[PDB]
Design a protein around this ligand. Structure first.
Ligand SMILES: *c1nc2ccccc2cc1Cn1c(C(=O)O)c(-c2ccc[nH]c2=O)c2cc(C)c(F)cc21
Length: 563
């Protein structure tokens, strides 16, 4: 069937859309080539619509059926809880899209009578009605990139009342089932340090390793009705409350498999028969579907001793090499099997014999040295998109601060330490906002974090070595330097000067600011301060940070205030 059908009504914006980076002194201090930075808008939605619309042909075989039964046997060990309306309300982000039914995210969080009554009515409707398609809104996503343009991605999501119901029926399932089924292959259970440990150990565990990333083109569009019912068959193996079983059955047929698309103006836009990006099951469903297809395709291809690592549609496989020619042929056999399963490739996969050459989750393993000179592996990435987005977030107030999430996840990197920490600490200190909580996203869930808490967060995530790395790889330094020239970012010497300046000011303030000066900016001085374990690090409640993925799932993981 066709992934989408369209009526001809346009994908519309709900307000004026900004496509150009503003010319602003604070953003200009970070990046001078402002014309290279853009944001996608509804103006390119028709180009995306063409790319995402196609017929799917899917053929399943014994390897697919065998792997599915293995997955269901593991899912059969799970007992999932139904969340109360109150618990599900608390998981709603404060800025989540308002309902069309007279209330918004703040009313949900406050347990307002109108919000709670409506959510209850939506829940009862899921229990009683197993067929009526649930409405969804289709919007063009606003995302920032550097030139060389990408058309906007399309986001599809149901009303706020339905989103709260999805949490009640499935939040516990999507949080616990993926690890029970996929074990060590489930990417979202790892912090960045644990992910690099798993990749390095897996690589080294092979006699003669070969690895590859597999890029599925327009993955959400390749997900078929059959895939979404297979995914439901795995969820149905859980022990579930009867109302949760019915809600999952009703959501599967009424929402997850497909449904009508409405634009921001209320016009009938078309019909979806593939994965919606903005529902609670997208991350878990994509991961399960990708894992299932790839595990079966590994068997079809006769790849030896595979270890996969999956996060949504992002897949990396590390295996035992059978020789150069044999590996090349086996990878072609894998791609053919994936294509039969409706997971055709974007970039054709290539065998890699060096762990550092593999990009998975847009990141690569690199090496630096700690204060003792010992090798430390860590994950890095090309900093172009992080810097372009940091420039946009400096010029405009954005709902999510990607710069803050990038400092958290990429804290050991040369670019996050020299550029991102320096830039934002300089601005926030001048604005007396170092202690002001900001929203960021980790594995798709929203968190409210004070920048002054970064040292203990980084210590917990990455270890104290994240504050002592030096002697970065020539390849990594070259990639950063080239990026700075391309974007017009001041050279590293300028960043060191700015860092020494903000470090002095932070130390002068005492308290949490002085801890930031000591740990975050020790790289900027010769006269190193002593770095000891931070008392706050061991008390941090990081429960729920690296458990599961929630991209598009409308999840907020920070604490709810008592009433
Ligand atoms: C990686 N790749 C993905 C592809 C498709 C769907 C999901 C998915 C998830 C990842 C995991 N991952 C994320 C992320 O956004 O979930 C991040 C990340 C970066 C910056 C801010 N917040 C984040 O969560 C990752 C960082 C690193 C170093 C990873 F190895 C994996 C990450």
């Amino acid at each position: 069937s066709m992934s989408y059908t369209w009526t001809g009504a346009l994908i519309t914006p709900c307000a004026a859309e900004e496509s150009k980076l503003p010319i602003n002194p604070l953003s200009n201090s970070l990046l001078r080539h402002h014309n290279m930075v853009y944001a996608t808008t509804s103006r390119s939605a028709s180009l995306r619509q063409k790319k995402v619309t196609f017929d799917r042909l899917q053929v399943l075989d014994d390897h697919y059926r065998d792997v599915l039964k293995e997955m269901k046997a593991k899912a059969s060990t799970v007992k999932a809880k139904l969340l109360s309306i109150e618990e599900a309300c608390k998981l709603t982000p404060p800025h989540s899209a308002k309902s069309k039914f007279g209330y918004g995210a703040k009313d949900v969080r406050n347990l307002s009578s109108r919000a709670v009554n409506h959510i209850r009515s939506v829940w009862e409707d899921l229990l009683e009605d197993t067929e009526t398609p649930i409405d969804t809104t289709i919007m063009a996503k606003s995302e920032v990139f550097c030139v060389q343009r990408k058309p906007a991605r399309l986001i599809v999501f149901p009303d706020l009342g339905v989103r709260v119901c999805e949490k009640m029926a499935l939040y516990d399932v999507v949080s616990t089932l993926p690890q029970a089924v996929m074990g060590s292959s489930y990417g979202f259970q790892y912090s960045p340090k644990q992910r690099v440990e798993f990749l390095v150990n897996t690589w080294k565990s092979k006699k003669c390793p070969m690895g590859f990333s597999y890029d599925t083109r327009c993955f959400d569009s390749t997900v078929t009705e059959s895939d979404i019912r297979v995914e439901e068959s795995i969820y149905q193996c859980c022990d579930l409350a009867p109302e949760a079983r019915q809600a999952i059955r009703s959501l599967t047929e009424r929402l997850y498999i497909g449904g009508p698309l409405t634009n921001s103006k209320g016009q009938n836009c078309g019909y979806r028969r593939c994965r919606a990006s903005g529902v609670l099951t997208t991350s878990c469903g994509n991961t399960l579907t990708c894992y299932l297809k790839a595990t079966a395709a590994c068997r079809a291809a006769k790849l030896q001793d595979c270890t996969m690592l999956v996060n949504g549609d992002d897949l990396v496989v590390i295996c035992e090499s059978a020789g150069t020619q044999e590996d090349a042929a086996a990878l072609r056999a894998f791609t053919e099997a994936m294509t039969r399963y409706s997971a055709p490739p974007g970039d054709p996969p290539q065998p890699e014999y060096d762990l550092e050459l593999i990009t998975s989750c847009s990141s690569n393993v690199s090496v630096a040295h700690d204060a003792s000179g010992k090798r430390v592996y860590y994950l890095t990435r090309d900093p172009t998109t992080p810097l372009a987005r940091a420039a946009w977030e400096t010029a405009r107030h954005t709902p999510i601060n990607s710069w803050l999430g990038n400092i958290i996840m990429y804290a050991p990197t040369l670019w996050a330490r020299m550029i991102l920490m320096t830039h934002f600490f300089s601005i926030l200190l001048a604005q007396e906002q170092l202690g002001k909580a900001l929203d960021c996203q980790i594995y798709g869930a929203c968190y409210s974090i004070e920048p002054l808490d970064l040292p203990q967060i980084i210590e917990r995530l990455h270890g104290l070595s994240a504050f002592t790395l030096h002697s970065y790889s020539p390849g990594e330094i070259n990639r950063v330097a080239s990026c700075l020239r391309k974007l017009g970012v001041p050279p590293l010497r300028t960043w060191r000067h700015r860092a020494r300046s903000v470090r002095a000011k932070l130390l002068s303030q005492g308290g949490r600011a002085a801890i930031c000066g000591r740990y975050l900016f020790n790289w900027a001085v010769r006269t190193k301060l002593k770095l000891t374990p931070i008392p706050a690090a061991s008390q941090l409640d990081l429960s729920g940070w690296f458990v599961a993925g929630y991209s598009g799932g409308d999840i907020y993981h920070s604490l709810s205030r008592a009433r």
